Symmetry: D2
Subunit: 206 residues, 4 copies
Amino acid sequence: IGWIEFITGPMFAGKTAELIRRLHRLEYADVKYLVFKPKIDTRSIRNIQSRTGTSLPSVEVESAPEILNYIMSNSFNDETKVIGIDEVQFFDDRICEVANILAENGFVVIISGLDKNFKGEPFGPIAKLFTYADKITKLTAICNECGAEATHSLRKIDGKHADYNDDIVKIGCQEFYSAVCRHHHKVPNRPYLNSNSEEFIKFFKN
Amino acid sequence: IGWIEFITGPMFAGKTAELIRRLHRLEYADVKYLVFKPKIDSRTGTSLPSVEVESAPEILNYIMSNSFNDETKVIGIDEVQFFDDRICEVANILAENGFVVIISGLDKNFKGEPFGPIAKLFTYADKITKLTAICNECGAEATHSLRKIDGKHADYNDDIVKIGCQEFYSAVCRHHHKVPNRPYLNSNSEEFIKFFKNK
Amino acid sequence: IGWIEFITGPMFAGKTAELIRRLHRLEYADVKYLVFKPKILPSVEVESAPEILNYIMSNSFNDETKVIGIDEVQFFDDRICEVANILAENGFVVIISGLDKNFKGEPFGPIAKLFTYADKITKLTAICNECGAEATHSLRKIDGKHADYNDDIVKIGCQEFYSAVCRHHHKVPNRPYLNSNSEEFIKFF
Amino acid sequence: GWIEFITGPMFAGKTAELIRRLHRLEYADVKYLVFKPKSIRNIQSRTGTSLPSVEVESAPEILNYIMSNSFNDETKVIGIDEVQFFDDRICEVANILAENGFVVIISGLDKNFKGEPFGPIAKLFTYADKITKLTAICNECGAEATHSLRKIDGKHADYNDDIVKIGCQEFYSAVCRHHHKVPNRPYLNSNSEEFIKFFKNKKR
Ligand SMILES: Cc1cn([C@H]2C[C@H](O)[C@@H](CO)O2)c(=O)[nH]c1=O
Ligand SMILES: Cc1cn([C@H]2C[C@H](O)[C@@H](CO)O2)c(=O)[nH]c1=O
Ligand SMILES: Cc1cn([C@H]2C[C@H](O)[C@@H](CO)O2)c(=O)[nH]c1=O
Ligand SMILES: Cc1cn([C@H]2C[C@H](O)[C@@H](CO)O2)c(=O)[nH]c1=O
Ligand SMILES: [Zn+2]
Ligand SMILES: [Zn+2]
Ligand SMILES: [Zn+2]
Ligand SMILES: [Zn+2]
């Protein structure tokens, strides 16, 4: 039938390039595809920057269910069998049901997005997406500090690491973000929820 | 140094075999490992001797105890889906403190939904291997575990924890996983299915 | 430590795009690289595989460079294997891209050995021009007609001569069988 | 049909992985058949997992067996272990099976003790739809191991030694590239020796 492919990893891993690669191969077989992207609510963005440059044509949607409405609309080409989704982490939980129904109905769904927000925690609905994806490709970047495989995105404001309670959404590139390995990802004021965690950390440092 | 590998997929995909395979390689290089499993009520082969723990934090307590050999820097964890949320913090802390953590567990419960705390482990895992079984119906790659009782597919609202093997469970592809009374959260979902149904 | 990464698959699989992706990763981390190509996307053209080691030894080479890219590797001879292994042994990361099969479906030049020496292998798929399944083979056609087994290996070109196909849609007239029971088995089936 | 190739050094779990892939079929009631070159009745991993197998002297005998009354017509999957012991003819056999609707899952060593391609396997990489290069753990440094090292009386095996030698930990270990050393390894390119010597000196 259909299925879900999920492309993930930190910033600077080339996630979007990988999505473009997968769509370009469809073009040589003349297989039709359609790409969607979430439109962030700019009222919920702390500081808006105006920029429109993009490497990949996609239809902006305000919410995940609007993908299904678009497919039901006159704008949709009925021969389209592949649905691409970029920057998926900006959707809410509603994307999971959408992607599943698409896959259950004969579509190949190719999804790209960040696995972790700046805190190193799951970004929005992507945790559940991992579970539903038939195929996962977790890409790596290169650690800006040591050059090892980078698995994390680190936000720095004026050289200072971002605090745990800072805003999830902050749009930007190298001016705010670097790719780092686990070892070089530090988040000030990260809490511990287990009762014996800080005891263990103290124990192993002696 | 220190990272997490996650081995996942439906029942009958050989997850435990893959965990065994990964850990067994260590024995030739004299690298010690220790396996943990949650408290849970064959062909030829040796199973992993493993410490039974009632909760994820008990893993760290064990490591700090006189029972743990401090030369051990590889930690195995099987049936991870039976843990609660606290497993993620345990795994991350181990990885941050020089341990290699190799984890196996089901990605989906019988409803086709994320099993326990599993979804978060995908994000925290450096390496993910999603294994496939073989669909009991069509032979394609199987991605889901299906529960039947007396021939009938288990209803959506049945209990999640139900221990057993082939008497209740089979592996199926997406198309052959059906859950009676599965709810739709999005208001346009059933509209779309009916719309697309018409050819 | 050094190593070899190998990107492969048929035409229209996006091999070059994947090579580009991996090198672009390096730029964000301030890691310098250098790409080489055989004679007939920025690269240094070399007439043979050992010339890569000569260029590196020359003073036109940036001493900072720790990553070596090699595109269209199937056009080199077997000498590329030693060169690649030498670089890996001497601290370089070598990222190689090339076709795994020629139009006949047989190993393209030196790549068979390269597979063995590579630490990491990524075999990419294209989309079959005939059925849309995963494509693993490159098919040549000259005038609607499939290329004969004994046609020339090197023939530079794009869609005017070539397509991606799955194994089932890859057909080569006059393909010989070297095993005595192969035709006996095929007739049986 | 199609071809899957499982490879990498000794102690990587290759046979264990073949067994895993084939065991999956049993729960779905899918028949398979395992072949091995040359326990004689089965293939086994080093943790005691095992499957029955037919042993063959050569690749063409696989097709002969499949054409005989001993072959179950329901068989969809063909497994082949220790493939490095076959000759070049294994490629054609594997291709023909894949072309005739069989899934062929193949396991074997990629490199001999010299670090060179083991027998016919270089071509199998090309013909295999799916490649799984497994790693062992370096006996020296604990890094991912990619090579098999042979030792004779505690000393590394010479380049000109016999390729075929049956044995486990008595002779063989798994090592990373850096810890794989073979005395009297020849340089085939006329500028390779001058490169190493130049580059080593560049650390001045
Ligand atoms: C890691 C991270 C990235 N981003 C943004 C930066 C980029 O604009 C975009 C990734 O392409 O997501 C966030 O908004 N929050 C985060 O926590
Ligand atoms: C799929 C599934 C498995 N299981 C059990 C059955 C097996 O005993 C165990 C997996 O080894 O998990 C559940 O309890 N609930 C479920 O939804
Ligand atoms: C498949 C095939 C491609 N090619 C060429 C076509 C393209 O120019 C190049 C692939 O990028 O290789 C051959 O020369 N011979 C072949 O058999
Ligand atoms: C590396 C190597 C292994 N072997 C053997 C040892 C093992 O019995 C078998 C691999 O399982 O192959 C050789 O015969 N020659 C070699 O060069
Ligand atoms: Zn780092
Ligand atoms: Zn099915
Ligand atoms: Zn086809
Ligand atoms: Zn080593």
